[PDB]
Amino acid sequence: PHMDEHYLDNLCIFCGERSEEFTEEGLDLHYWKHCLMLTRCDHCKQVVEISSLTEHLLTECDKKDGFGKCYRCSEAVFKEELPRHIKHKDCNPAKPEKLANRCPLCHENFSPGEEAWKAHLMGPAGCTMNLRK
Ligand SMILES: [Zn+2]
Ligand SMILES: [Zn+2]
Ligand SMILES: [Zn+2]
Ligand SMILES: [Zn+2]
């Protein structure tokens, strides 16, 4: 069946919301301040997907050379604190990406997939560490 010619318009592809105010730059303001699926990186001040934040910090951020990956929790840690982080063994261990999503804000492992990401970050009684919520 025919896809609407303007289906990709007035839509935030990250949280799914549609709105007349979501013009091309109504969307830029949406990402910068409001979208529950995104965050501003405190280190480089860019907007990033929360579900991509660890990968951002380790491989993309302007400040990526200041982070290393904890092989226990899979999260980015400041390079200087990583030995102590590793020694303290207090982080929540990670699971295979096919088995679980991992929230970098609250450190929970949960049901994999995009629908789960949305329910965790935007749903009721979901993520307690999402500062836009
Ligand atoms: Zn959004
Ligand atoms: Zn960054
Ligand atoms: Zn760790
Ligand atoms: Zn969370």
Numbering used by the authors: 743 to 875
Sentences from the study reporting this entry:
It is mutated in Joubert syndrome, a genetically heterogeneous ciliopathy. Here we provide structural and biochemical data that Cep104 contains a tubulin-binding TOG (tumor overexpressed gene) domain and a novel C2HC zinc finger array.
The residue S763 is located at the loop connecting the β hairpin to the α helix of the first ZNF. The Cep104 ZNF structure consists of four tandem C2HC Zn fingers that pack together to form a single globular domain that, to our knowledge, represents a novel, previously unobserved arrangement of Zn fingers. They consist of a β hairpin followed by an α helix that packs on it. The Zn ion is coordinated by two Cys residues located on the hairpin and by His and Cys residues from the helix with the exception of ZNF3 and ZNF4, in which the last Zn-coordinating Cys is located at a loop region downstream of the C-terminal helix cap (left). In the Cep104 domain, the sequence separation between the individual ZNFs is variable and increases from two residues between ZNF1 and ZNF2 to eight residues between ZNF3 and ZNF4. The strict conservation of these residues suggests that the compact globular shape of this domain is not due to crystal packing but that the four C2HC Cep104 ZNFs probably function as an integral, single unit.
